[PDB]
């Protein structure tokens, strides 16, 4: 029950520079960073699914963790049409307190 098998990792190095080797100190660590990355993403992605009061992990909340934290957009999956972007819901209390900063400044 391992997800990466040291031949898929070796081809990941061969596609970058084919005359390059890794050490077993580096391979045993490169097999470790991916597994930790999977655990961190899944635990956060479960709480986004637990936020929506659902019990199924969809692709719409593995998207929101990688975009916001890890800066990863995985292209070939597609989403629903994004709703019209709400720009500024500035409240009345901010519209009247910030209209006092200017009232003292110029008057």
């Amino acid at each position: 029950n391992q997800v990466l098998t040291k031949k898929k990792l070796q081809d990941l190095v061969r596609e970058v520079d084919p005359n390059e080797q890794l050490d077993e100190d580096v391979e045993e660590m490169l097999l470790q960073i991916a597994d930790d990355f999977i655990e961190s993403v899944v635990t956060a992605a479960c709480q986004l699914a637990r936020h929506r009061k659902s019990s199924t992990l969809e692709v719409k909340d593995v998207q929101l963790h990688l975009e916001r934290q890890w800066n990863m957009w995985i292209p070939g999956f597609g989403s629903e049409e994004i709703r019209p972007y709400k720009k500024a819901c500035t409240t009345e209390a901010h519209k009247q307190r910030m209209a006092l900063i200017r009232k003292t400044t110029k008057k």
Binding site: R97, M98, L100, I101
Partner: protein, 95 residues
Amino acid sequence: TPLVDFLMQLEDYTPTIPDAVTGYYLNRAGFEASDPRIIRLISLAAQKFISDIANDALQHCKMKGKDRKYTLTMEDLTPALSEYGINVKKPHYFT
């Protein structure tokens, strides 16, 4: 290599940041800069960084239209810094 051939275009340039200012901030960073062309390259690369934040804030100010004197207000610098990795968030109206 481009880093060497660029350095021949730097013998006629003189950055705004002096060499004693840059040569001190490399001393806090961990080395004494012996070659004075490395001081002329880290100061130019850091002068270019200020000269794009202060220029994006100008085009942010010239995109709100007032056309006589341009004041470097925080309303033009704070969106201009977010395009790079500087995220300021200043408060107002402390209750």
